[PDB]
Design an enzyme around this catalytic site. Structure first.
Site, PDB file in Angstrom:
ATOM      1  N   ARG A 129      88.701  67.033  31.487  1.00 57.26           N
ATOM      2  CA  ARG A 129      88.552  67.151  32.835  1.00 57.26           C
ATOM      3  C   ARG A 129      87.579  66.331  33.457  1.00 57.26           C
ATOM      4  NH1 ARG A 129      92.826  68.736  35.039  1.00 57.26           N
ATOM      5  NH2 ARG A 129      91.312  69.057  36.683  1.00 57.26           N
ATOM      6  N   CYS A 164      94.750  59.237  31.517  1.00 56.38           N
ATOM      7  CA  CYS A 164      95.357  58.100  32.439  1.00 56.38           C
ATOM      8  C   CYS A 164      94.925  58.369  33.859  1.00 56.38           C
ATOM      9  CB  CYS A 164      96.852  58.046  32.283  1.00 56.38           C
ATOM     10  SG  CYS A 164      97.726  56.672  33.408  1.00 56.38           S
ATOM     11  N   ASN A 215     104.898  71.162  38.106  1.00 53.11           N
ATOM     12  CA  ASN A 215     103.891  70.247  37.044  1.00 53.11           C
ATOM     13  C   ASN A 215     104.296  70.727  35.631  1.00 53.11           C
ATOM     14  OD1 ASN A 215     101.794  69.478  35.481  1.00 53.11           O
ATOM     15  ND2 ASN A 215     100.437  69.329  37.412  1.00 53.11           N
ATOM     16  N   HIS A 241     100.817  64.505  35.987  1.00 55.18           N
ATOM     17  CA  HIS A 241     100.820  63.422  35.031  1.00 55.18           C
ATOM     18  C   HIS A 241     102.361  63.209  34.793  1.00 55.18           C
ATOM     19  CE1 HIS A 241      96.448  63.276  34.454  1.00 55.18           C
ATOM     20  NE2 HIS A 241      96.859  62.114  34.125  1.00 55.18           N
TER      21      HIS A 241
HETATM   22 MN   LIG Z   1     101.293  68.114  33.857  1.00 51.33          MN
HETATM   23 ZN   LIG Z   2      99.631  57.021  32.317  1.00 55.58          ZN
END
Ligand SMILES: [Mn+2]
Ligand SMILES: [Zn+2]
Ligand SMILES: [Mn+2]
Ligand SMILES: [Zn+2]
Ligand SMILES: [Zn+2]
Ligand SMILES: [Zn+2]
Lengths: 162, 162
Positions: free
Chosen positions: A60, A104, A118, A97
């Site tokens: 985090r 990233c 998500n 993500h």
């Molecule tokens: Mn995710």
């Molecule tokens: Zn990425």
DNA sequence: TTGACTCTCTTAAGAGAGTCA
DNA sequence: TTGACTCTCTTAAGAGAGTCA
């Protein structure tokens, strides 16, 4: 509080800093037996991380800027979405993500959606394997597949019907 | 308890008691535009729940038996799997509802798998829509679909590539 | 104003254990 | 011995806020 122009300036400074993160090329499953390539902009493993960035947990981070003597702080992946609605269908929006790579911070690898949406991307067959996400997945989810179930449905007697 | 005979006796008494729970018919999406019918054996909403059963949480229950003068207690959906390994690949095995109905204790609607496999069934397209679970789903997951993503991947400048 | 740490919290799929009668 | 309650914990996708110099 912060004006539209000030928020745009925060997003621009965030993009400038993240764009200088190491860019790592990853080959990834797309579904349908096909392979693709993603380019992740990865925050460093240890301090210093980049101007404005600090680690608040094992995976985090937060972004911090001080404007007109007031300290402002955001989750490090939420900055691309500061001009977007922050909830939908009564659910909080989360940074999600598409590359499934926490470090990233490439905004082309992020979307902004409920925590359920998500999470669900973890099991998606991918953009070439049957993805039905309206905002399409960039890759097959890391947990897609037959699974490793230890024991299936079963009974010892005759008390039940499916 | 310790003996195989004692464990089978626990499973048999559990099946006895759960077999007397009300049987509630649920019509469910299978994927592929098809629908099916499941028969869930549902624990009562309030006490008394049945011999050996007690509620420890809004949607959590425990089964308890006295063996050799000692109380033994289990999560209420774990009893069918007491003779199975309690871990897989170093991950804890969990009772997993194929019917996505917590109150149901039909062992023909349960499997025994990692929490990740368990969770992932929420987004499965279902047995007639492309389920690849080796232990097959009984229905399309309740969260399958396009999602409600508020914002997709985007950048303001020219620092990033996919 | 900035960096590098610290702490606890949310969610929804799942758990273990204690207090009384 | 059995029943009916109480409490906190686990996981892996995500969060906010404090302290010090
Ligand atoms: Mn995710
Ligand atoms: Zn990425
Ligand atoms: Mn489940
Ligand atoms: Zn997808
Ligand atoms: Zn059921
Ligand atoms: Zn499935």
């Amino acid at each position: 509080a912060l004006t539209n122009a000030q928020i745009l300036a925060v997003i621009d400074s965030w993009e400038e800093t993240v764009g200088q993160f190491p860019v790592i090329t990853h080959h990834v499953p797309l579904g349908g037996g096909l392979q693709g390539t993603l380019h992740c902009y990865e925050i460093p493993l240890a301090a210093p991380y980049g101007v404005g960035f600090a680690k608040n947990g094992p995976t985090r981070w937060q972004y911090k800027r001080t404007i007109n003597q007031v300290v402002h702080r955001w989750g490090s992946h939420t900055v691309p979405f500061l001009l977007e609605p922050d909830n939908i269908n009564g659910k909080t929006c989360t940074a999600s993500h598409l590359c499934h790579n926490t470090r990233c911070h490439n905004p082309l690898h992020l979307c902004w959606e409920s925590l359920d949406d998500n999470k669900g991307r973890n099991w998606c067959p991918g953009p070439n394997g049957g993805c039905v996400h309206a905002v399409v997945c960039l890759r097959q989810g890391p947990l897609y597949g037959p699974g490793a179930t230890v024991a299936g449905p079963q009974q010892r007697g005759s008390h039940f019907v499916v």
